[model samples]
Target: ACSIVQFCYFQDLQAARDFLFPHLREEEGNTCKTQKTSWLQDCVLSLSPTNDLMVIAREQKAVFLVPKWKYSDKGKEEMQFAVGWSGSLNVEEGECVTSALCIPLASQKRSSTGRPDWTCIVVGFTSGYVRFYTENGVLLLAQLLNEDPVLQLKCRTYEIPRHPGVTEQNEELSILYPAAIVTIDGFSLFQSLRACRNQVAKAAASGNENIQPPPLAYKKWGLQDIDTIIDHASVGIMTLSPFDQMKTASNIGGFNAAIKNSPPAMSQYITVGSNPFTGFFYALEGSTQPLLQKPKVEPATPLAVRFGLPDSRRHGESICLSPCNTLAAVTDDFGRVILLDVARGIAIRMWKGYRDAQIGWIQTVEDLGPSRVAQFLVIYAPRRGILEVWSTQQGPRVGAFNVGKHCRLLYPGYKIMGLNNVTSQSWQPQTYQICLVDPVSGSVKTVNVPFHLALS
Candidate 1:
């Protein structure tokens, strides 16, 4: 039988810089960069008689659609409907509501106040209302009550069900969406953050009704709440280095004990550079900063308001760090990327390449491949469109390809597009041609986004 293989990799500032720095400089000039010179079109959509526009939502992991109108044998006319991940609603039908000549003036989530997961909202022409919704468009609550309708609607992230555990499988709550309770309404965003605190309490008690959440967990800075206790279900406990250490030790070898992991146990320290604005990525045990009796820093003490750590080569602006990987990547305002050492607080590597060699905004990043060694960056360019690329130590050595036009990621590989990026106003349009490029060969391919058809 083969023994589980394991090796510990320490943060090396120089190695990371050497690996990524050159690529950042290489693409600075050689890559093709474009600045959109115009907004050629506004509000327009085309849906076929048998189909509706599939408005796939990246964050919500669901799709929405504006249904096609159809005439019923017994009735003089039947209104078409809009349907997708959240639910469905009937809307005023437009002429020739087939493959062409169709548009969404408004749509909404079916309800606003029921099971947190079954939440929805309604968009009317220029404004919209937040409501509760079942998985099948059944409205249970009504909250936003928008007077000036925006062209968009969405459910709260708190509804996304992860498995009961912290990994993607067990827990299913989202911090990105506004919290579930709407009564605390200082601002929806503020309310959303507050709701997060409430949910954590529920999680900690395993849905116990009697246990009131500690006051600290309910504050705006929920993650750093001083009174927040360290428990298997609570969110604020500080975790030791390498969030996955315990599991790795159990499955592989106890490399942590094998070698002395720095700053021994009980020696509490803040992560040094964490973004409270971005909020907690997920409710996992141990990632929070520990409180040492020596310094006796309160967990609620927020980090000083300053720009976060930056790429070694750049100054003034902090490099937006990637999630936990030792190898983290950051993209410039124009989509150029740099990799850095996550632990030692340094930029030790860099890389550069593209298929179309075009600039874009990176919304999602992941490591996906045969052995999971290869990394991918999901990039979005307002005009150029969306694409994915893989990265390795040598640099971005291959081409990037377009996932779809107007496409946005729901969670991972799932995407919905061909209808402008969904917005607080209304879903935007594809205004320009988006394509995929091979990072290695720099070859490009056009994505044929089929309208009204969105999927995982």
Candidate 2:
């Protein structure tokens, strides 16, 4: 029943210094208190794919849709859209949502005419269930994905072969725009676009349409309940890739697989996840053809990682896969990070030096270039008030930088850049920047603001 909404404003650093310092010096204020402007809003529970939309699971289930830039209205300045509640008036009680992902689906033809693709928000709850909601917040499909509470929910766009065709360049043509869903718990569950569409079709046939659906209700689904769907196997430590692909040499190597395939050849997608049970990360490739049998378990191919010894305390706390899904960075409680080449099932490099400090979050910066060879890994060491950047080409090449002594929060700034080449600038590439804020001190530091070359 917590319903507090707080807001903050951003001003030019020079402007703030000129205004605040001068005013405070004159108002009989010899001593000034350093006020750390941390977030006034309740802690963020989950973030959507686009910054415009965010879902907060705590303090009642709700979604906040915000504008890209701040606006002003006389005395008030800041633009925020109306909030949407998860539990509708038709529901009995609210169920806590644990994880959610916003997916933008592309238009695809199913029966006769092609329907325009719309966005959907996939949410997972503590009750071991998952549901898909339209942009309008209408529940279109729900399923019992796992017996354990869903810890992570992710979705990505993938392509597959609709029909084999030779392109003018003498290449094979394939279908793109199919969406895939991945859910995590004690184990990970993988679902392809075909499987999801089939399930949605089944649900629609059962006349389950609603203007405002009730909060999700938990129910144990039997084996018969999920027989016709795509690969519904929940058997890996973690799984990557949105859809199944055909195994090929170019497609089996690394992040370059996507571009390597000419005429959009279908490539096999493998799973990437951790196994605390086995003390290693594993990979499972999908079958060349769809499994004829329903409700069956598939074994995963162990991407055997070597460590001197296995400690129960060493567990993967968070994971960040590269944009291509060929590489992954796994941060553990042991104050170490493991970089795995997901395509080859090899631990490429391991970074350490935080001592007992916990690694809070790990993210990969897209490597868009002819000169830029490796992807950049941004790691936040909260307890140490440090931010470390690493390049995939070299091992632990970039040293850590201290933003503030008590700085526990680090966020990547999404800076928009307009390119004249493109007709529509709406889908421009975002340059990366590391934003570090010290909650104890009011000071804030930003690294690589406009370009990465400025960073040390």
Candidate 3:
């Protein structure tokens, strides 16, 4: 019954210490979108393809092409690239000019010499401009005679047999007419027999010149799934299966059996009676008709959702936990990071305040935590200027790093706060700084990157 203090009812110093837990300075509060400064609308864009080629193309940009094999085994993935050669498959690019943004939304692959050649279509955000690139960057030209600033573009390369008068048709138009024939733009033509005869003897020529011998045979490979793509000409077509007819797998057991195995297979193939627009999942394992189902986006109650929010569209774009995939960043369009938790149905956090004209990705997501609590740390580089990192976990200036310090930093802890009091605009730096902060802190750290990380 110690009553020396008016309100102290025999509590000891240990009790006082327990009550004074570390003050959490910052948090991912409100679970809603908070706008950064209006000036923060700098040129920004990020792209994450199925290949794990995560690219963030801000204002100024460079591109890097890297390969990622499988998660089961870790080896240096090969890019198989040359400096100035056309790409063998589809690749992507993103661009922005002052107030405008252009992204290569779709790339098409055509059969050529037993392999696939690519034709790319880029759609501009503000300008509605679309441009096509053939053979990687060798033939970067616009397919349309005039620029109308297309909104969404999709592309798919069709396996059209040689016809008497037709060559190529718009993929968007051909989807309804997969078997319908139309004249088109891309075709391999043979030199006339007369031209070959005038230049060289028929004996010297190996094959017939007038007849177009289907120049290339198709090669076989494994396909993860099909994606719908828009061409540069504002055409929408579902992506074709990459596996060759000769290489198509032999099906052991079909869909219902496969779904019992893994959700990856369950969600890959969908079955719809005849609606071409509905999403379809296909299981490519053992050759069989893929189990098909339509994936309807049922917005579950924020409190009792089964599946989590939609996966992030691009890197640096996050999903909010409002029972659906809601973006929760202050980026006007570019200059921000997107974070999404597949299990939580929410975008746990978003990192913003990037002042760079352009930011690029340097390294892949490398896990640094215990194998049980698996997480990935990605590194990014800024092209022009530097970005500051204020901790949201410990305190302002505590457990933080500068963008110029490293090409990138991993997601140490998703939740950290600075003294900026719900925002970073007013926080002062000199008030608190621990010089002893090192890389061994065993926490998540946010980093900034240059634009060059995008270039191959």
Best by TM-score: 2
| Tens-digit lDDT string for candidate 1 (208-257) | 44433222121112234211111111122234556455543454455444
Against the true structure, candidate 1 has what lDDT?
0.28
List lDDT for all candidates, in order: 0.28, 0.38, 0.23
What is model 2's C-alpha RMSD? Answer: 13.5
Tens-digit lDDT string for candidate 3 (1-456):
101111101112122112222231156685656522211122122221212122222232323222323323456442221122212212334423211111222212221222111212232322222333222333232222112223222222232222243233222211111111111222211122123233334434654354322211111112112222121111112222334211222233344332222222211211111112112223232342211111121211111111222223422222111111111121213556434332222345555654322221112222333222111222132443243322221122211223332123222110111111222232212111011111122111223322222221
Q: What's the CA RMSD for each of the models?
A: 19.3, 13.5, 23.8
Q: Deviation in angstroms for 13 in model 2? A: 22
lDDT at 100, model 2: 56
By TM-score, the better pick of 1 and 3 is 1
- What are the runs in model 3 whose C-alpha is more than 4 Å off? 1-129, 135-338, 342-345, 350-456
| Candidate 1: stretches off by over 4 Å | 1-63, 66-132, 135-219, 222-238, 241-307, 310-328, 348-373, 380-388, 392-396, 402-456
- Per residue, candidate 2 scores C-alpha lDDT tens digits across 162-262 of 22431111111111101122322210112232344545566679754433332221111122111111111121223234343334334555655553232
Ranking by TM-score: 2, 1, 3
Total clashes for model 2: 3
TM-scores of the candidates are: 0.33, 0.49, 0.24
Residue 379, candidate 2: C-alpha displacement in angstroms: 1.1
Compared with the true structure, the alpha-carbon lDDT of candidate 2 equals 0.38
